[PDB]
Design a protein around this nucleic acid. Structure first.
Ligand SMILES: [Mg+2]
Ligand code: NA
Ligand code: NA
Ligand code: NA
Length: 324
DNA sequence: GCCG
DNA sequence: CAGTACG
DNA sequence: CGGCCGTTACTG
């Protein structure tokens, strides 16, 4: 509806993001999102300001795109940006690492491979550079979820496994497959990672681990790489979280996303003196002048996702309606 | 970058 | 801790 | 002025 202007802002948003100006980038992200979530192609200054997420600064920029069909700002983007994007797309490397490598003279992935000091995660990220920038058809996400579920129910058929993220939101393609695991008895979820992960390794499904604290029986998540059997298969990102039944609803809400939806919902909760996380929804939370949680408050009973919305005074939304 |  | 990551 | 999600979860 307004791609002729968002397409340009998205360039700036990305530029600020890779350079580490996270707040400014966030502002652009929201503005661009609004412009997309809109309908009528904005054609007036005052008409832009009247839109939530768009201020005078952004409005002036939109105007220049309709009067000049261009944004002079785009001509002053540092030449380092494309390289910073190239580098930050390595899993495990963010804007600080990208900026450091650029300062050190690195300009290509060949430079990184041959001269950069890589962390264990980054080396895995580099090896799967193209792989991790690809999306898979949702049908493959189903296969991956089933593979994890089968392995889990193999030693405890009572384990409840659910694919979340974009898959649950009904998207045609998925990036990271997100599997949430829990158990109705509220206890059999404890210390099952090592058994589950070892089982998935046994069959050669898991090929590399990015985040997996297996020394601690309190491990909450596994971020890794997997690949289904047979020809024509690519390495995919797999994220698994194991949670106690009492936190099932909040964990499910969190893992289903989207990320921006979660942030919006948590922001709303804070305005109501509450707090929302993947662990729980709490009321009567005590915060300092900086909005930081000082007092825990009381955890509210949230057996289902509907309960979370209800307690927040919000109409329930199907996963497909949380694709923000 | 926006907003309260 | 800072950095990076998850939705 | 100053928050912008989570007293979020690992890594080293
Ligand atoms: Mg995902
Ligand atoms: Na990265
Ligand atoms: Na480990
Ligand atoms: Na370790």
């Amino acid at each position: 509806h307004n791609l002729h202007i968002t397409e340009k802002l998205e360039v700036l948003a990305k530029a600020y993001s890779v350079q580490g100006d996270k707040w400014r980038a966030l502002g652009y992200a929201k503005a661009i999102n609004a412009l997309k979530s809109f309908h009528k192609p904005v054609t007036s200054y005052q008409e832009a300001c009247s839109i939530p997420g768009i201020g005078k600064r952004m409005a002036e920029k939109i105007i220049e795109i309709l009067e000049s069909g261009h944004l002079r700002k785009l001509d002053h983007i540092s030449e380092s940006v494309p390289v910073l994007e190239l580098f930050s797309n390595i899993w495990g490397a963010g804007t600080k690492t990208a900026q450091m490598w650029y300062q050190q003279g690195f300009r290509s992935l060949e430079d990184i491979r041959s001269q950069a000091s890589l962390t264990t995660q980054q080396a895995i990220g580099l090896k799967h550079y193209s792989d991790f920038l690809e999306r898979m058809p949702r049908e493959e996400a189903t296969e991956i979820e089933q593979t994890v579920q089968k392995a889990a129910q193999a030693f405890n058929s009572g384990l409840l496994c659910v694919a979340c993220g974009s898959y649950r939101r009904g998207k045609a393609t998925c990036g990271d497959v997100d599997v949430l695991i829990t158990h109705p008895d509220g206890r059999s979820h404890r210390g099952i990672f090592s058994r589950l992960l070892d089982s998935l390794r046994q069959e050669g499904f898991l090929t590399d681990d990015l985040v997996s604290q297996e020394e601690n029986g309190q491990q909450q998540k596994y971020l890794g790489v997997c690949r289904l059997p047979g020809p024509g298969r690519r390495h995919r990102r797999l994220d698994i979280i194991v949670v106690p039944y009492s936190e099932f609803a909040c964990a499910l809400l969190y893992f289903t996303g989207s990320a921006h939806f979660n942030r919006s919902m948590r922001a709303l909760a804070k305005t109501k003196g509450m707090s929302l996380s993947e662990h729980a929804l709490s009321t009567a939370v005590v915060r300092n002048t900086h909005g930081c949680k000082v007092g825990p408050g009381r955890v509210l009973p949230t057996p289902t996702e509907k309960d979370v919305f209800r307690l927040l005074g919000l109409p329930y939304r199907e996963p497909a309606e949380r694709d923000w």
